[PDB]
């Protein structure tokens, strides 16, 4: 097994527009959505087939009840936040909780909040503390740090419970999550602006989205400016990316323990 992660996000919007829900919560195993809930449907639903087939209705029932409570607490927390900042109009409140089970078997845990898309409060499970960005965040921190039981509960959920759910879902989603689709790499050369030649190293059809791409001149790194293309979803469960240089050059690609060289 390579590096895998479990995350849950919560989005709260005060006074939303016509369509948009007041509350949304989505879960992810790596880049894959797994679960969904909002203040319109008011139901926790699967977003992956391997979740729908492996978790019995009792799971969806219990978590729907939990999410309805969380929805209400999020609406109250954003009202208090807006009041502290002396803010009117539409504002956002976000949370992200999660996991990582690393290749070496070690683990990571994170719990963070954002107000208007900016960092607000960051949990430190090692010192059992909240890191505050400003004085509003400092006021909230003090209230949260007074409840020692909740801090301890949060450390146990992050270190133990989250990892156990992650290991559970990785097993259900094994045919998707643990697969490898190797990349199709090509080099395209072109005389661009009258004097310069641009070289493009392009990869596609790969899964997982983690790919390492670089250009090397004579076996050593490129001191010149390398342009990088974003790792983009192709729409079929696979990804694409590129790297480019201007002018013995060679493209180097690393994906799932396989190194590829394309000499020009």
């Amino acid at each position, epitope marked *: 097994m390579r590096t895998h992660s479990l995350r849950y996000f919560r989005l709260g919007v005060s006074d939303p527009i016509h369509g948009v829900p007041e509350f949304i919560s989505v879960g992810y195993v790596d880049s894959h959505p797994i679960t969904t809930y909002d203040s319109v449907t008011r139901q926790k639903e699967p977003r992956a087939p391997w979740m729908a087939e492996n978790l019995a209705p009792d799971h969806w029932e*219990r978590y729907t009840q939990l999410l309805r409570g969380w929805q209400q607490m999020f609406k109250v927390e954003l009202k208090r936040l807006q009041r502290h900042y002396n803010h009117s109009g539409s504002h956002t409140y976000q949370r992200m909780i999660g996991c990582e089970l690393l290749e070496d078997g070690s683990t990571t845990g994170f719990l963070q909040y954002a107000y208007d898309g900016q960092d607000f409060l960051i949990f430190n499970k090692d010192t059992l503390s909240w890191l505050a960005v400003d004085n509003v965040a400092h006021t909230i921190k003090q209230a949260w740090e007074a409840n020692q039981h909740e801090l301890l*509960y949060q450390k*146990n959920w992050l270190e133990e*419970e989250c990892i156990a759910w992650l290991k559970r879902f990785l097993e259900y989603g094994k045919d998707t999550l643990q697969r490898t689709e190797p990349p199709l790499v090509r080099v395209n050369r072109k005389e661009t602006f009258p004097g310069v030649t641009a070289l493009f190293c392009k990869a596609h059809g790969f899964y997982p989205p983690e790919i390492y791409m670089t250009w090397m001149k004579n076996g050593e790194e490129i001191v010149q400016e390398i342009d990088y293309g974003d790792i983009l979803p192709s729409g079929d469960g696979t990804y694409q990316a590129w790297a480019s240089i201007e002018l013995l050059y060679s493209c180097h690609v690393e994906h799932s323990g396989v190194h590829m060289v394309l000499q020009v």
Partner: antibody
């Protein structure tokens, strides 16, 4: 979860020490609670444990070992007033509080 | 903190009964348990916040509503002798925290 086990009854002498054991077999773990329920009254909160260790609150101490799925409530310098039922409750992965049948503690004067 | 009404009741089987539960702590989560000899506390129904209810381990023969944060009524639409028990109402601030129990209601259903 599925099972919380604590003895039905325990008898000890006044001024002595008693350790009330609780083993749990749950699907996930989000904390262990100990409550005291005097005959004919409501249960009242004694302690919460979620991480490994012993927590002292006067004559009462609660211990937890997550790897063993085991807790104990230790009562020192036993008084007649300590004659009550002691309930063990575990919060599983679905945030459902699972209650043990309770341990009736009898104190010999 | 929590009050329950009535605290004692004898009911003829087939009759309707409503156990009332009021809290003042503005706790979001509310619970109804039944306590019978040899068993623990068995959850009948729960409510995580105003406007939602869930079924517990023993929901049959009972119904609940949660229109407001403060109240959580338990209805027995047609009482049966097996509904003879001690009923406790409980509340918690959140879903991960400790429960505060109401005094209890001793209900006896007779043929």
């Amino acid at each position: 979860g599925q099972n919380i086990d604590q003895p039905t009854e325990m008898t000890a002498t006044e001024g002595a020490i008693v350790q009330i054991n609780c083993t749990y077999q749950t699907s996930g773990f989000n904390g262990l609670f100990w409550y005291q329920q005097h005959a004919g009254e409501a249960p009242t909160f004694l302690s919460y444990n979620v991480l490994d260790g012993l927590e002292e609150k006067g004559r009462f101490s609660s211990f937890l070992s997550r790897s063993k799925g085991y807790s104990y409530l230790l009562l020192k310098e036993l008084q007649m007033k300590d004659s009550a039922s002691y309930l063990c409750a575990v919060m599983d992965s679905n945030y459902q509080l699972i209650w043990g049948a309770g341990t009736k503690l009898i104190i010999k004067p | 903190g929590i009050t329950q009404a009535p605290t004692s009741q004898i009911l003829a089987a087939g009759r309707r009964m409503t156990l009332r539960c009021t809290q003042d702590m503005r706790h979001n989560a509310m619970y109804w348990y039944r306590q019978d000899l040899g068993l623990g506390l068995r959850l009948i129904h729960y409510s995580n916040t105003a406007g939602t209810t869930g079924k517990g381990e023993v929901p049959d023969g009972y119904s609940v509503s949660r229109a407001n944060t403060d109240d959580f009524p338990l209805t027995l639409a047609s009482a049966v002798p097996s509904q003879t028990s001690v009923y406790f109402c409980a509340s918690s601030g959140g879903t991960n925290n400790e429960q505060f129990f109401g005094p209890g209601t001793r209900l006896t259903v007779l043929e």
